[PDB]
Protein backbone atom coordinates (compact mmCIF):
# COMPACT_ATOMS: atom_id res chain seq x y z
CA UNK A 1 0.00 0.00 0.00
CA UNK A 2 3.07 2.31 0.59
CA UNK A 3 6.94 2.39 0.39
CA UNK A 4 7.35 0.28 3.60
CA UNK A 5 5.22 -2.54 2.12
CA UNK A 6 7.17 -2.10 -1.20
CA UNK A 7 10.50 -2.82 0.56
CA UNK A 8 8.95 -5.73 2.60
CA UNK A 9 7.50 -7.28 -0.61
CA UNK A 10 10.89 -6.94 -2.45
CA UNK A 11 12.58 -8.96 0.38
CA UNK A 12 9.79 -11.58 0.65
CA UNK A 13 9.70 -12.29 -3.12
CA UNK A 14 13.50 -12.99 -3.54
CA UNK A 15 14.96 -13.73 -0.08
CA UNK A 16 12.50 -16.10 1.74
CA UNK A 17 11.86 -19.85 1.70
CA UNK A 18 9.42 -21.99 3.71
CA UNK A 19 11.48 -24.07 6.21
CA UNK A 20 9.99 -27.12 7.96
CA UNK A 21 11.60 -28.82 11.00
CA UNK A 22 10.05 -31.36 13.46
CA UNK A 23 8.89 -28.24 15.47
CA UNK A 24 6.83 -26.70 12.60
CA UNK A 25 6.76 -24.53 9.46
CA UNK A 26 8.75 -21.21 9.60
CA UNK A 27 9.39 -18.19 7.40
CA UNK A 28 13.20 -18.37 6.70
CA UNK A 29 15.21 -15.30 5.53
CA UNK A 30 17.98 -16.05 3.04
CA UNK A 31 20.89 -13.55 3.54
CA UNK A 32 23.63 -14.39 0.95
CA UNK A 33 25.03 -17.47 -0.90
CA UNK A 34 23.39 -20.56 0.81
CA UNK A 35 23.24 -18.84 4.28
CA UNK A 36 19.80 -18.27 5.92
CA UNK A 37 18.48 -17.51 9.46
CA UNK A 38 15.65 -19.08 11.57
CA UNK A 39 14.63 -18.82 15.27
CA UNK A 40 16.75 -21.19 17.42
CA UNK A 41 13.53 -22.80 18.86
CA UNK A 42 12.98 -24.30 15.35
CA UNK A 43 15.63 -26.92 16.56
CA UNK A 44 17.35 -27.31 13.13
CA UNK A 45 18.90 -30.79 12.66
CA UNK A 46 21.04 -32.48 9.95
CA UNK A 47 18.06 -32.44 7.49
CA UNK A 48 15.46 -29.66 6.93
CA UNK A 49 12.64 -29.21 4.29
CA UNK A 50 13.03 -26.06 2.09
CA UNK A 51 9.90 -25.38 -0.03
CA UNK A 52 9.00 -29.12 0.61
CA UNK A 53 12.40 -30.44 -0.75
CA UNK A 54 14.56 -32.59 1.58
CA UNK A 55 17.81 -30.52 2.10
CA UNK A 56 21.04 -31.40 3.98
CA UNK A 57 22.20 -28.82 6.58
CA UNK A 58 25.93 -28.15 5.93
CA UNK A 59 26.24 -26.06 9.19
CA UNK A 60 23.94 -24.64 11.92
CA UNK A 61 25.07 -22.23 14.67
CA UNK A 62 22.84 -21.00 17.56
CA UNK A 63 24.20 -17.47 18.21
CA UNK A 64 24.89 -16.24 21.76
CA UNK A 65 26.40 -12.89 22.82
CA UNK A 66 29.82 -12.53 24.52
CA UNK A 67 28.08 -12.90 27.93
CA UNK A 68 27.03 -16.42 26.67
CA UNK A 69 23.35 -15.20 26.58
CA UNK A 70 20.93 -16.68 23.97
CA UNK A 71 20.21 -14.41 20.96
CA UNK A 72 17.51 -16.78 19.48
CA UNK A 73 19.10 -16.61 15.97
CA UNK A 74 20.41 -19.80 14.27
CA UNK A 75 22.51 -19.29 11.07
CA UNK A 76 22.01 -22.20 8.70
CA UNK A 77 24.07 -23.11 5.62
CA UNK A 78 21.87 -25.17 3.21
CA UNK A 79 23.12 -27.75 0.65
CA UNK A 80 20.99 -25.98 -1.97
CA UNK A 81 21.75 -25.73 -5.78
CA UNK A 82 20.96 -21.98 -5.88
CA UNK A 83 22.23 -18.85 -4.03
CA UNK A 84 20.20 -16.04 -2.39
CA UNK A 85 20.45 -12.45 -3.59
CA UNK A 86 23.07 -10.84 -1.26
CA UNK A 87 21.07 -8.49 1.12
CA UNK A 88 23.83 -7.93 3.76
CA UNK A 89 24.02 -4.19 2.77
CA UNK A 90 20.38 -3.85 4.16
CA UNK A 91 21.45 -5.08 7.68
CA UNK A 92 22.01 -2.51 10.45
CA UNK A 93 25.48 -2.27 12.04
CA UNK A 94 24.29 -1.26 15.58
CA UNK A 95 21.38 -1.94 18.04
CA UNK A 96 18.74 0.78 17.52
CA UNK A 97 15.07 1.82 17.78
CA UNK A 98 13.02 2.29 14.54
CA UNK A 99 9.82 3.96 13.29
CA UNK A 100 7.17 2.39 11.02
CA UNK A 101 8.20 -1.28 10.63
CA UNK A 102 6.43 -4.12 8.70
CA UNK A 103 6.40 -7.81 9.80
CA UNK A 104 6.06 -10.14 6.75
CA UNK A 105 5.29 -13.93 6.86
CA UNK A 106 5.07 -16.57 4.14
CA UNK A 107 3.94 -20.09 5.22
CA UNK A 108 1.24 -22.68 4.14
CA UNK A 109 -1.00 -21.26 7.00
CA UNK A 110 -0.24 -17.52 6.26
CA UNK A 111 0.83 -16.82 2.63
CA UNK A 112 1.68 -13.21 1.50
CA UNK A 113 0.99 -11.78 5.01
CA UNK A 114 2.17 -8.17 5.79
CA UNK A 115 1.51 -6.40 9.18
CA UNK A 116 2.34 -2.71 9.85
CA UNK A 117 3.56 -3.00 13.50
CA UNK A 118 4.52 0.69 13.90
CA UNK A 119 7.26 1.83 16.31
CA UNK A 120 10.00 -0.70 17.27
CA UNK A 121 11.74 -0.36 20.70
CA UNK A 122 15.29 -1.60 21.51
CA UNK A 123 13.81 -3.66 24.41
CA UNK A 124 17.01 -5.58 25.23
CA UNK A 125 16.59 -8.34 27.82
CA UNK A 126 13.54 -10.70 27.55
CA UNK A 127 12.79 -13.96 29.40
CA UNK A 128 11.58 -15.71 26.21
CA UNK A 129 9.74 -18.97 27.07
CA UNK A 130 11.94 -19.20 30.23
CA UNK A 131 15.27 -18.50 28.33
CA UNK A 132 17.14 -15.23 29.18
CA UNK A 133 17.50 -13.56 25.74
CA UNK A 134 19.36 -10.37 24.61
CA UNK A 135 19.05 -7.89 21.67
CA UNK A 136 15.19 -8.11 21.55
CA UNK A 137 13.12 -5.58 19.53
CA UNK A 138 9.49 -5.01 20.72
CA UNK A 139 6.39 -3.85 18.77
CA UNK A 140 2.81 -3.34 20.07
CA UNK A 141 0.94 -5.88 17.88
CA UNK A 142 -0.82 -9.07 19.13
CA UNK A 143 1.26 -11.53 17.05
CA UNK A 144 0.09 -15.21 17.12
CA UNK A 145 1.37 -18.79 16.58
CA UNK A 146 2.56 -19.14 12.92
CA UNK A 147 4.50 -15.80 12.62
CA UNK A 148 7.89 -16.98 14.04
CA UNK A 149 10.73 -16.36 11.55
CA UNK A 150 8.72 -13.46 10.05
CA UNK A 151 10.92 -10.66 8.64
CA UNK A 152 10.92 -7.21 10.31
CA UNK A 153 11.81 -4.38 7.88
CA UNK A 154 11.74 -0.60 7.59
CA UNK A 155 12.25 1.14 4.19
CA UNK A 156 15.82 0.20 3.21
CA UNK A 157 16.56 -2.06 6.28
CA UNK A 158 16.06 -5.72 7.39
CA UNK A 159 16.26 -5.32 11.18
CA UNK A 160 15.03 -8.61 12.76
CA UNK A 161 13.18 -11.93 12.71
CA UNK A 162 9.98 -12.47 14.84
CA UNK A 163 10.64 -14.97 17.73
CA UNK A 164 7.70 -14.56 20.19
CA UNK A 165 4.81 -12.59 21.76
CA UNK A 166 2.83 -12.21 25.05
CA UNK A 167 -0.61 -11.70 23.40
CA UNK A 168 -0.38 -7.82 23.36
CA UNK A 169 3.28 -7.31 22.20
CA UNK A 170 5.56 -9.04 19.62
CA UNK A 171 9.33 -9.67 19.94
CA UNK A 172 12.03 -9.98 17.24
CA UNK A 173 15.73 -10.98 17.44
CA UNK A 174 18.02 -8.26 15.95
CA UNK A 175 19.86 -8.97 12.74
CA UNK A 176 23.29 -7.21 12.67
CA UNK A 177 25.78 -6.91 9.72
CA UNK A 178 28.52 -8.43 11.98
CA UNK A 179 26.67 -11.81 12.17
CA UNK A 180 27.26 -12.43 8.40
CA UNK A 181 30.90 -11.43 7.68
CA UNK A 182 32.67 -14.45 5.99
Swiss-Prot record:
Reaction(s) catalysed (UniProt annotation): Selective cleavage of Gln-|-Gly bond in the poliovirus polyprotein. In other picornavirus reactions Glu may be substituted for Gln, and Ser or Thr for Gly
Domain of life: Viruses
Compartments, as annotated in UniProt: Host cytoplasm
Cysteine pairs bridged by disulfides in the record: none
Residues in Peptidase C3 domain copies: 2-180
Active site: 41, 72, 148
Protein function: Major viral protease that mediates proteolytic processing of the polyprotein. Cleaves host EIF5B, contributing to host translation shutoff. Also cleaves host PABPC1, contributing to host translation shutoff. Binds and inhibits host IFIH1/MDA5, thereby inhibiting the type-I IFN production and the establishment of the antiviral state. Cleaves host MAP3K7/TAK1, resulting in inhibition of TRAF6-triggered NF-kappa-B induction. Cleaves host TICAM1; this interaction allows the virus to disrupt host TLR3 signaling. Cleaves host IRF7, resulting in inhibition of type-I IFN production.
Subunit-level organization: Interacts with host IFIH1/MDA5; this interaction inhibits host IFIH1.
Protein name listed in UniProt: Protease 3C
Native species: Human enterovirus D68
Residues of the full protein shown: 1549 to 1729 of 2188
Amino acid sequence: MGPGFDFAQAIMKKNTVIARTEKGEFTMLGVYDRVAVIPTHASVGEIIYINDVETRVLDACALRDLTDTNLEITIVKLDRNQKFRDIRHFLPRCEDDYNDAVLSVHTSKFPNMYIPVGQVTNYGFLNLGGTPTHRILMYNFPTRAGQCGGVVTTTGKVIGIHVGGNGAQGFAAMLLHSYFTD
